């Protein structure tokens, strides 16, 4: 594992964004983290969504607290109710992202039912479209219509990650395809913009802005802190880095090496573009890009605790600055499960 | 008005129809005619209906012209479809094109868009009201699969003649914006799997194929219309937005250095296309092929894009690159060619009026 550049890019990154202390305080990160999954954890314990989300109690279980990490720490300027139902949300596509079953059956009707107001055949379906409206209810009506769209790709893009295609060679345009349509990009941006904080046509040409560049922040920062617990025990996986070997029929590094000059690239735009906009709106996303990396560093689904030691006894500019970062990151983002995940969801249900 | 770079289009143009072999085919012209007629003469029908005549505000002379550039569009393109797809997909793609004349906030029409929608009750927005109920007619003729692509297109496209209304060309900086834009409007997807009925294609064992289809053909598509239709916005002080426009704005670049960026993008596209598909299932490459030969056809014989102006100004230049172009503009002309009088007819007002 080149752990050389994997640290030279990820300083970069965080100097880029202006990676920093927050008035977020360890105690008010728990207080959110709990409330979101308090009311997460009572919603996937019902009857209902017991019985229609086929998902190993276990799974479900570590799913929800990755997730509620996730939006807990990037979406820290929402209402603690806003972060519950996003928490919900974005739970129900962490699970569709793991399942193994055929979609191409259930979805046979789906537009005529859709048309028809009737509940669809696919069960994911039937219960994220029928608790949707709880996290609309947060938005105006173009940032709902992102989430809606975002929602719908992402759900083509499981059913093409099934086939664990990679692309064919020299298909060069795959890759990204791919990653846009199952990266949720548009659903992050947009719910980044709650209505009773944001005024959705006052700051049109803002949030369409921030949507159409946070899409590819988003997805590049996550693919980069992913490639360790990828690269690592991977699984015949397939990945936007693993597809740009595939597709360009170039190397593991050339391909790493593209990725990290987009995220770069994309990093260095972000603050040009919105430094001197609104000040809301500047804030809403720093706090996102800042908390987005706490919650890569900290949570243990990318196993960034283990690039710790190989590094924490050493002399490097940049390995030095690594855990510089990574401790500010514990100092405010290492927080034991025992402290919010509580009771586990299988007790409720 | 400055000067349109004749040379450098004319040469992009020719290196794109080599790149993707531009030629002759077995499509004759009766049976484009026979085509042409057939999807005009069903969409003709379908808009002159009173519900349709209602709700869908247009001009009639803009909608008469709209139908009739999308008719020669899908008919050109799309070659190896039933005429009734071909009929169906030419009424879907001219309510494409019409939402571009609307000026109408979509706004208060989207308030309640996803309850309705759960709920089964009519949309707000006239347009989603018609497009939806007609929907069906176009998803007939593919598999859930397809079908998925084709509905979140036509989504995207809504949220994409939306933003169009702010006349945005993006934050100085904010060079993800232009793509984000032309993918959003660009109908990729629509396109993409709308080449692929059911009953000549089966989706499942062709998945990979058309899935890789999709994802090329999406850029390939958008990025040949931009560079076709460059010479006619050149001088268009009234439209004010388009991917190379965008280009200029969000990149802080020249005009020049933008249309440089679109030709690479083009070039290298075509090039992926062949390299990709020419070695797979035949009747893949045979629909893909057909599509780009189409698709370049009628950017050349449709009157909207006033390529026949550059035909014109250099059809007795002695040039190597205007030699190539006069001779596949030629067979275009040879081919795609055909008076208005043989197919489109009657007028669309004139049914709706009866």
Redesign the interface.
Known sequence: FPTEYFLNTTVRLLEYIRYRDSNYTREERIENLHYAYNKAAHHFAQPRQQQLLKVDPKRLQASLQTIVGMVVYSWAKVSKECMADLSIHYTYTLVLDDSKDD??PT??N???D?????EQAHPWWALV??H??NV?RHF???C???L??ST??F??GC??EQ?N?G??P?????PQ??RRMNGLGHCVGASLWPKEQFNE?SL??EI??A???M??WMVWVNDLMSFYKEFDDERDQISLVKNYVVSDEISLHEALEKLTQDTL??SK?MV??FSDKDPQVMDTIECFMHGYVTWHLCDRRFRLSEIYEKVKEEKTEDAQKFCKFYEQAANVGAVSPSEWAYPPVAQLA
Not at 170 to 174: I, V
């Open positions: 979609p191409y979805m046979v789906y537009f005529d859709l048309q028809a107001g009737r479209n029928e949707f409206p609309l105006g009506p173009f709902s219509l992102n809606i769209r719908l790709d759900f083509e059913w093409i086939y295609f692309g064919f020299g298909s060069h345009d795959y395809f791919l046509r049109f040409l369409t802005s949507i159409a560049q899409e590819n690239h994309s735009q040009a573009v």
